[PDB]
Protein backbone atom coordinates (compact mmCIF):
# COMPACT_ATOMS: atom_id res chain seq x y z
CA UNK A 1 0.00 0.00 0.00
CA UNK A 2 1.94 2.98 -1.33
CA UNK A 3 -0.85 5.24 -0.12
CA UNK A 4 0.06 4.22 3.44
CA UNK A 5 3.63 5.43 2.92
CA UNK A 6 2.34 8.68 1.43
CA UNK A 7 0.04 9.19 4.45
CA UNK A 8 2.89 8.45 6.86
CA UNK A 9 5.04 11.04 5.11
CA UNK A 10 2.21 13.54 5.37
CA UNK A 11 1.89 12.88 9.12
CA UNK A 12 5.64 13.33 9.67
CA UNK A 13 5.55 16.61 7.75
CA UNK A 14 2.59 17.70 9.89
CA UNK A 15 4.61 16.89 13.01
CA UNK A 16 7.50 19.01 11.75
CA UNK A 17 5.14 21.90 11.00
CA UNK A 18 3.59 21.71 14.47
CA UNK A 19 7.02 21.70 16.14
CA UNK A 20 8.17 24.62 13.99
CA UNK A 21 5.09 26.65 14.90
CA UNK A 22 5.51 25.85 18.60
CA UNK A 23 9.19 26.85 18.55
CA UNK A 24 8.22 30.44 17.70
CA UNK A 25 8.48 32.89 20.59
CA UNK A 26 8.48 36.38 19.05
CA UNK A 27 9.17 38.32 15.85
CA UNK A 28 12.35 40.23 15.09
CA UNK A 29 10.06 43.05 14.00
CA UNK A 30 8.92 43.18 17.65
CA UNK A 31 12.21 42.59 19.48
CA UNK A 32 14.19 44.93 17.17
CA UNK A 33 12.13 47.99 18.06
CA UNK A 34 13.34 51.36 19.36
CA UNK A 35 16.93 50.72 18.28
CA UNK A 36 19.28 53.15 16.58
CA UNK A 37 19.14 52.81 12.77
CA UNK A 38 22.09 53.24 10.44
CA UNK A 39 20.45 56.10 8.54
CA UNK A 40 20.21 57.05 4.90
CA UNK A 41 23.19 55.96 2.82
CA UNK A 42 24.82 57.99 0.06
CA UNK A 43 27.40 56.18 -2.06
CA UNK A 44 29.18 57.23 -5.24
CA UNK A 45 31.13 55.43 -7.95
CA UNK A 46 34.91 55.26 -7.73
CA UNK A 47 36.30 53.03 -10.51
CA UNK A 48 35.28 51.91 -13.99
CA UNK A 49 36.62 48.91 -15.91
CA UNK A 50 36.21 48.72 -19.68
CA UNK A 51 38.06 45.69 -21.07
CA UNK A 52 35.26 43.30 -22.07
CA UNK A 53 33.02 43.42 -25.12
CA UNK A 54 30.00 41.20 -24.31
CA UNK A 55 27.80 40.33 -21.33
CA UNK A 56 29.44 39.45 -18.00
CA UNK A 57 28.09 36.58 -15.96
CA UNK A 58 30.17 36.17 -12.79
CA UNK A 59 32.86 37.74 -10.63
CA UNK A 60 34.84 36.89 -7.50
CA UNK A 61 37.05 39.03 -5.26
CA UNK A 62 40.52 37.86 -4.33
CA UNK A 63 41.88 37.00 -0.91
CA UNK A 64 43.83 40.27 -0.60
CA UNK A 65 40.95 42.51 -1.78
CA UNK A 66 42.98 43.81 -4.67
CA UNK A 67 42.70 41.27 -7.52
CA UNK A 68 39.53 40.29 -9.42
CA UNK A 69 38.58 37.54 -11.84
CA UNK A 70 35.94 38.19 -14.50
CA UNK A 71 34.32 35.79 -16.96
CA UNK A 72 32.25 36.95 -19.95
CA UNK A 73 30.53 35.51 -23.06
CA UNK A 74 33.87 35.80 -24.90
CA UNK A 75 36.81 33.29 -24.86
CA UNK A 76 38.55 35.60 -22.38
CA UNK A 77 38.94 35.30 -18.55
CA UNK A 78 40.38 38.70 -17.47
CA UNK A 79 42.28 39.38 -14.24
CA UNK A 80 42.00 42.97 -12.99
CA UNK A 81 44.04 45.09 -10.63
CA UNK A 82 41.48 47.28 -8.91
CA UNK A 83 43.81 49.84 -7.35
CA UNK A 84 45.25 50.93 -10.69
CA UNK A 85 43.15 49.83 -13.61
CA UNK A 86 45.62 47.40 -15.17
CA UNK A 87 45.22 44.02 -16.80
CA UNK A 88 47.40 41.35 -15.22
CA UNK A 89 46.34 38.30 -17.25
CA UNK A 90 44.14 37.43 -20.24
CA UNK A 91 43.05 33.80 -20.49
CA UNK A 92 41.95 32.33 -23.86
CA UNK A 93 39.15 29.82 -23.30
CA UNK A 94 38.08 26.69 -25.17
CA UNK A 95 34.33 27.42 -24.99
CA UNK A 96 32.63 30.80 -25.27
CA UNK A 97 29.71 29.80 -22.99
CA UNK A 98 30.50 30.62 -19.35
CA UNK A 99 28.26 30.95 -16.30
CA UNK A 100 30.55 30.74 -13.23
CA UNK A 101 34.02 31.87 -12.17
CA UNK A 102 35.85 31.38 -8.87
CA UNK A 103 39.22 32.53 -7.48
CA UNK A 104 41.28 30.11 -5.41
CA UNK A 105 41.97 31.30 -1.85
CA UNK A 106 45.70 30.71 -2.16
CA UNK A 107 45.65 32.87 -5.32
CA UNK A 108 47.38 30.15 -7.40
CA UNK A 109 44.44 28.78 -9.49
CA UNK A 110 41.18 29.80 -11.26
CA UNK A 111 38.02 27.88 -12.13
CA UNK A 112 35.63 28.34 -15.06
CA UNK A 113 32.47 26.55 -16.12
CA UNK A 114 29.37 26.83 -18.23
CA UNK A 115 27.03 25.14 -20.70
CA UNK A 116 29.81 22.77 -21.75
CA UNK A 117 29.17 20.81 -18.52
CA UNK A 118 32.94 20.46 -17.99
CA UNK A 119 34.96 22.19 -15.28
CA UNK A 120 38.28 23.73 -16.35
CA UNK A 121 40.87 24.64 -13.71
CA UNK A 122 43.74 26.94 -14.69
CA UNK A 123 47.19 27.38 -13.20
CA UNK A 124 48.52 30.93 -13.10
CA UNK A 125 52.14 30.76 -11.88
CA UNK A 126 54.13 28.66 -14.38
CA UNK A 127 57.77 28.96 -15.38
CA UNK A 128 57.03 29.12 -19.12
CA UNK A 129 55.17 32.36 -18.41
CA UNK A 130 51.92 31.36 -20.11
CA UNK A 131 48.80 29.98 -18.46
CA UNK A 132 48.56 26.22 -19.02
CA UNK A 133 45.31 24.32 -18.43
CA UNK A 134 45.81 22.27 -15.27
CA UNK A 135 42.90 19.82 -15.38
CA UNK A 136 39.46 19.13 -16.83
CA UNK A 137 36.63 17.56 -14.83
CA UNK A 138 33.82 15.63 -16.50
CA UNK A 139 30.80 13.72 -15.28
CA UNK A 140 27.94 16.23 -14.99
CA UNK A 141 24.84 15.45 -17.02
CA UNK A 142 23.71 19.10 -16.98
CA UNK A 143 25.42 22.47 -17.03
CA UNK A 144 27.38 24.03 -14.17
CA UNK A 145 25.71 26.92 -12.34
CA UNK A 146 28.17 27.65 -9.52
CA UNK A 147 31.56 26.48 -8.27
CA UNK A 148 33.73 27.42 -5.28
CA UNK A 149 37.11 26.38 -3.91
CA UNK A 150 37.90 24.72 -0.60
CA UNK A 151 41.69 24.45 -0.93
CA UNK A 152 44.32 23.86 -3.60
CA UNK A 153 43.12 20.26 -4.03
CA UNK A 154 39.32 20.20 -3.62
CA UNK A 155 36.43 22.03 -5.28
CA UNK A 156 32.62 22.04 -5.13
CA UNK A 157 30.24 22.16 -8.09
CA UNK A 158 26.50 22.71 -8.52
CA UNK A 159 25.01 21.10 -11.62
CA UNK A 160 22.05 21.62 -13.91
CA UNK A 161 20.61 18.23 -13.02
CA UNK A 162 19.61 17.36 -9.49
CA UNK A 163 23.14 16.85 -8.12
CA UNK A 164 26.09 18.55 -6.42
CA UNK A 165 29.58 17.07 -6.33
CA UNK A 166 32.94 17.07 -4.55
CA UNK A 167 36.02 16.73 -6.78
CA UNK A 168 39.63 15.78 -6.12
CA UNK A 169 41.81 17.75 -8.54
CA UNK A 170 44.75 15.33 -8.70
CA UNK A 171 42.61 12.34 -9.67
CA UNK A 172 39.67 13.63 -11.67
CA UNK A 173 37.29 11.00 -10.38
CA UNK A 174 34.75 12.34 -7.92
CA UNK A 175 34.81 11.58 -4.21
CA UNK A 176 31.32 12.30 -2.88
CA UNK A 177 27.93 13.07 -4.41
CA UNK A 178 24.94 14.82 -2.81
CA UNK A 179 21.55 13.97 -4.34
CA UNK A 180 18.37 15.14 -2.66
CA UNK A 181 16.91 17.80 -4.91
CA UNK A 182 14.17 17.75 -7.54
CA UNK A 183 15.26 20.37 -10.04
CA UNK A 184 18.05 22.70 -11.11
CA UNK A 185 20.59 23.68 -8.43
CA UNK A 186 21.24 27.32 -9.22
CA UNK A 187 23.67 28.60 -6.55
CA UNK A 188 25.90 27.53 -3.68
CA UNK A 189 27.75 29.24 -0.82
CA UNK A 190 30.45 27.87 1.48
CA UNK A 191 30.62 28.38 5.24
CA UNK A 192 33.73 30.00 6.78
CA UNK A 193 34.35 26.86 8.83
CA UNK A 194 34.00 24.90 5.53
CA UNK A 195 32.33 22.07 7.45
CA UNK A 196 28.95 22.81 5.81
CA UNK A 197 27.63 24.47 2.67
CA UNK A 198 24.20 25.64 1.50
CA UNK A 199 22.70 24.96 -1.93
CA UNK A 200 19.64 26.65 -3.43
CA UNK A 201 17.51 25.11 -6.17
CA UNK A 202 14.47 25.66 -8.42
CA UNK A 203 11.88 23.73 -6.36
CA UNK A 204 11.52 26.53 -3.78
CA UNK A 205 13.79 24.96 -1.18
CA UNK A 206 17.26 25.21 0.32
CA UNK A 207 19.27 22.34 1.75
CA UNK A 208 22.00 22.10 4.36
CA UNK A 209 24.79 19.63 3.61
CA UNK A 210 27.69 18.40 5.72
CA UNK A 211 30.63 17.45 3.52
CA UNK A 212 32.00 14.39 5.35
CA UNK A 213 28.75 12.57 6.16
CA UNK A 214 27.31 13.34 2.73
CA UNK A 215 23.71 13.52 3.93
CA UNK A 216 21.16 16.33 4.09
CA UNK A 217 20.37 18.01 7.42
CA UNK A 218 17.64 20.59 6.89
CA UNK A 219 15.04 21.66 4.31
CA UNK A 220 13.60 25.19 4.32
CA UNK A 221 10.43 26.25 2.50
CA UNK A 222 8.37 29.41 2.08
CA UNK A 223 9.34 30.92 -1.26
CA UNK A 224 6.65 30.54 -3.91
CA UNK A 225 9.03 30.76 -6.86
CA UNK A 226 12.48 29.59 -7.87
CA UNK A 227 15.47 30.97 -5.92
CA UNK A 228 18.53 32.24 -7.76
CA UNK A 229 21.36 33.13 -5.34
CA UNK A 230 22.42 32.50 -1.75
CA UNK A 231 25.11 33.63 0.70
CA UNK A 232 26.05 33.03 4.33
CA UNK A 233 25.79 35.45 7.20
CA UNK A 234 29.30 36.17 8.56
CA UNK A 235 28.46 34.61 11.93
CA UNK A 236 27.73 31.29 10.24
CA UNK A 237 24.28 30.71 11.72
CA UNK A 238 22.31 32.37 8.93
CA UNK A 239 22.05 32.86 5.19
CA UNK A 240 19.99 34.88 2.71
CA UNK A 241 18.07 33.80 -0.39
CA UNK A 242 16.71 35.74 -3.35
CA UNK A 243 14.05 34.46 -5.72
CA UNK A 244 11.87 35.51 -8.65
CA UNK A 245 9.26 36.79 -6.20
CA UNK A 246 11.33 39.96 -5.70
CA UNK A 247 11.64 39.12 -2.00
CA UNK A 248 14.71 38.25 0.07
CA UNK A 249 14.54 35.98 3.11
CA UNK A 250 16.89 35.34 6.04
CA UNK A 251 16.97 31.90 7.67
CA UNK A 252 18.59 30.62 10.83
CA UNK A 253 19.66 27.15 11.75
CA UNK A 254 18.91 26.61 15.43
CA UNK A 255 15.42 28.10 15.41
CA UNK A 256 14.68 26.37 12.06
CA UNK A 257 12.25 29.12 11.00
CA UNK A 258 12.01 32.08 8.61
CA UNK A 259 12.94 35.32 10.38
CA UNK A 260 12.47 38.33 8.11
CA UNK A 261 11.23 39.17 4.62
CA UNK A 262 12.18 42.24 2.61
CA UNK A 263 9.63 43.51 0.10
CA UNK A 264 7.86 46.63 -1.12
CA UNK A 265 5.28 47.47 -3.77
CA UNK A 266 7.69 49.28 -6.10
CA UNK A 267 9.92 46.26 -6.79
CA UNK A 268 8.52 43.61 -9.17
CA UNK A 269 11.68 42.40 -10.93
CA UNK A 270 13.50 39.33 -9.68
CA UNK A 271 16.83 39.00 -7.89
CA UNK A 272 20.06 37.78 -9.49
CA UNK A 273 22.66 38.23 -6.73
CA UNK A 274 22.66 38.51 -2.93
CA UNK A 275 25.60 39.20 -0.61
CA UNK A 276 26.36 40.32 2.95
CA UNK A 277 28.87 42.90 4.09
CA UNK A 278 31.17 42.55 7.05
CA UNK A 279 29.55 43.00 10.48
CA UNK A 280 26.22 41.90 9.01
CA UNK A 281 24.51 45.26 8.95
CA UNK A 282 23.85 45.71 5.23
CA UNK A 283 22.41 43.34 2.62
CA UNK A 284 23.24 43.97 -1.05
CA UNK A 285 20.76 42.70 -3.66
CA UNK A 286 21.02 43.09 -7.42
CA UNK A 287 17.67 43.46 -9.18
CA UNK A 288 16.88 43.10 -12.88
CA UNK A 289 15.78 46.67 -13.57
CA UNK A 290 19.33 48.10 -13.57
CA UNK A 291 19.43 48.74 -9.84
CA UNK A 292 21.03 47.64 -6.58
CA UNK A 293 19.60 47.98 -3.10
CA UNK A 294 21.08 48.14 0.40
CA UNK A 295 18.67 46.65 2.93
CA UNK A 296 18.36 47.35 6.62
CA UNK A 297 18.97 43.89 8.00
CA UNK A 298 16.97 44.30 11.21
CA UNK A 299 14.17 46.62 10.08
CA UNK A 300 11.51 46.63 7.36
CA UNK A 301 12.26 50.05 5.88
CA UNK A 302 14.73 50.34 3.01
CA UNK A 303 18.14 51.96 3.10
CA UNK A 304 19.66 54.00 0.30
CA UNK A 305 19.55 52.90 -3.31
CA UNK A 306 22.44 52.27 -5.69
CA UNK A 307 21.41 52.88 -9.32
CA UNK A 308 24.00 53.70 -11.95
CA UNK A 309 24.04 50.81 -14.39
CA UNK A 310 22.59 50.48 -17.87
CA UNK A 311 21.28 46.88 -18.01
CA UNK A 312 20.49 43.88 -15.83
CA UNK A 313 22.76 43.45 -12.79
CA UNK A 314 24.41 40.05 -13.16
CA UNK A 315 26.73 39.66 -10.17
CA UNK A 316 27.95 41.54 -7.11
CA UNK A 317 30.56 40.73 -4.48
CA UNK A 318 31.81 42.45 -1.31
CA UNK A 319 35.49 42.42 -0.41
CA UNK A 320 36.94 40.42 2.45
CA UNK A 321 38.03 43.52 4.37
CA UNK A 322 34.86 45.49 3.62
CA UNK A 323 36.52 48.21 1.59
CA UNK A 324 34.29 48.18 -1.48
CA UNK A 325 31.56 46.36 -3.40
CA UNK A 326 31.96 45.30 -7.02
CA UNK A 327 29.12 45.13 -9.52
CA UNK A 328 29.23 43.61 -12.98
CA UNK A 329 26.17 44.03 -15.18
CA UNK A 330 25.22 42.83 -18.63
CA UNK A 331 26.97 45.80 -20.15
CA UNK A 332 30.70 45.23 -20.47
CA UNK A 333 31.62 47.47 -17.54
CA UNK A 334 32.35 46.67 -13.92
CA UNK A 335 31.88 49.32 -11.23
CA UNK A 336 33.65 49.37 -7.87
CA UNK A 337 31.66 51.37 -5.33
CA UNK A 338 32.79 52.75 -1.96
Amino acid sequence: ELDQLRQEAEQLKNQIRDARKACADATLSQITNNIDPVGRIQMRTRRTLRGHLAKIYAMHWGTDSRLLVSASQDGKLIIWDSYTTNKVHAIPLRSSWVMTCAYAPSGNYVACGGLDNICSIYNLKTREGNVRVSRELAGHTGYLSCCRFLDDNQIVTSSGDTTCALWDIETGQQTTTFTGHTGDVMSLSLAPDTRLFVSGACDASAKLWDVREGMCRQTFTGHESDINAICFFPNGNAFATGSDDATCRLFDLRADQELMTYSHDNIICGITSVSFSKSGRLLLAGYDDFNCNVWDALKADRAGVLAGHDNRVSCLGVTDDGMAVATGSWDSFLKIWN
Binding site: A9, I31, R254, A255, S279
Partner: protein, 57 residues
Protein backbone atom coordinates in the same frame (compact mmCIF):
# COMPACT_ATOMS: atom_id res chain seq x y z
CA UNK B 1 11.59 1.92 -8.08
CA UNK B 2 8.67 3.78 -6.51
CA UNK B 3 8.86 1.65 -3.36
CA UNK B 4 12.59 2.28 -2.96
CA UNK B 5 12.21 6.02 -3.54
CA UNK B 6 9.38 6.21 -1.02
CA UNK B 7 11.46 4.33 1.54
CA UNK B 8 14.34 6.74 1.01
CA UNK B 9 12.09 9.80 1.45
CA UNK B 10 10.42 8.41 4.58
CA UNK B 11 13.77 7.59 6.20
CA UNK B 12 15.11 11.06 5.32
CA UNK B 13 12.12 12.79 6.90
CA UNK B 14 12.23 10.54 9.98
CA UNK B 15 15.86 11.49 10.56
CA UNK B 16 14.94 15.19 10.27
CA UNK B 17 12.54 15.16 13.23
CA UNK B 18 15.24 14.09 15.72
CA UNK B 19 17.12 17.44 15.63
CA UNK B 20 17.36 19.66 18.73
CA UNK B 21 16.20 23.28 18.55
CA UNK B 22 16.32 26.39 20.75
CA UNK B 23 14.28 29.55 21.26
CA UNK B 24 13.73 31.92 18.34
CA UNK B 25 13.85 34.99 20.57
CA UNK B 26 17.31 33.98 21.73
CA UNK B 27 18.48 33.81 18.10
CA UNK B 28 16.92 37.20 17.34
CA UNK B 29 18.69 38.69 20.36
CA UNK B 30 21.99 37.12 19.27
CA UNK B 31 21.68 38.71 15.85
CA UNK B 32 20.81 42.06 17.46
CA UNK B 33 23.87 41.87 19.71
CA UNK B 34 26.37 40.57 17.14
CA UNK B 35 26.02 43.53 14.78
CA UNK B 36 26.18 46.12 17.57
CA UNK B 37 29.31 44.49 18.99
CA UNK B 38 31.20 44.62 15.66
CA UNK B 39 30.15 48.02 14.30
CA UNK B 40 33.61 49.60 14.69
CA UNK B 41 35.19 47.78 11.72
CA UNK B 42 32.64 48.35 8.96
CA UNK B 43 33.89 50.74 6.29
CA UNK B 44 30.57 50.92 4.45
CA UNK B 45 28.32 52.01 7.32
CA UNK B 46 30.25 55.25 7.89
CA UNK B 47 32.73 57.09 5.65
CA UNK B 48 36.35 56.26 6.49
CA UNK B 49 39.18 58.87 6.45
CA UNK B 50 40.58 59.75 3.05
CA UNK B 51 44.06 58.98 4.33
CA UNK B 52 42.86 55.42 5.00
CA UNK B 53 41.01 54.89 1.72
CA UNK B 54 42.86 52.88 -0.96
CA UNK B 55 40.35 54.25 -3.49
CA UNK B 56 41.23 57.90 -2.85
CA UNK B 57 42.50 58.91 -6.29
Amino acid sequence: ASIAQARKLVEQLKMEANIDRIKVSKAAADLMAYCEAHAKEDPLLTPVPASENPFRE
